[PDB]
Structure 1
Amino acid sequence: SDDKIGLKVLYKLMDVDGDGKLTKEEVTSFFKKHGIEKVAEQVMKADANGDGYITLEEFLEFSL
């Protein structure tokens, strides 16, 4: 649960783009208000793939 209960909550609430995945553009867009900065860094290191997004599946996969 705590694995990403909240992170997911907010995230799921964040994903406004229109897909369900937590992408940078979409992130910085919505996070632009939050800590897009600190988030940008964390997100940048989060992706650790190339330039994708954080999907519920990937979000739970990373927690697992």
Structure 2
Amino acid sequence: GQDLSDDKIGLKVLFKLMDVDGDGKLTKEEVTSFFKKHGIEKVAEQVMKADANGDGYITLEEFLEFSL
């Protein structure tokens, strides 16, 4: 009876999992470690150019915005 999690349940899980600090937001450094798994460095320019708020970190929302 419990409503499952949006099809993006996987993305949300991984993101949160990478955030052992349970802050709900990943920092530039974190974004590099997560993407590092692919060996892609472009993630740095993408996360820096995607940060319109210059907060230096991305929350669940942002993480879901960077997937395509």
Which TM-score band (shorter chain)? 0.5 to 0.7
Conservation of the 8 A alpha-carbon contact between 1:4 and 1:63: no
**What TM-score does the superposition give when structure 1 sets the normalisation length?**
0.52
Please tell me whether residue 42 in structure 1 is matched to residue 50 in structure 2: no
User: 1:27 Cα deviation (Å)?
Assistant: 1.2
Conservation of the 8 A alpha-carbon contact between 1:27 and 1:36: no
**What TM-score does the superposition give when structure 2 sets the normalisation length?**
0.51
User: 1:25 Cα deviation (Å)?
Assistant: 0.8
User: 1:5 Cα deviation (Å)?
Assistant: 5.8
Q: Deviations over 1:27-51 (max 9, x none)?
A: 1123222254121121111112224
Which aligned runs of 4 or more in structure 1 are off by greater than 4 angstroms?
1-7, 57-64
Please tell me whether residue 29 in structure 1 is matched to residue 33 in structure 2: yes
* Identical pairs, percent: 98
Q: C-alpha separation between the residues in 2 aligned to 1:3 and 1:62?
A: 15
Aligned length: 64
Say which is worse superposed, 15-24 or 37-46, in terms of deviation.
15-24
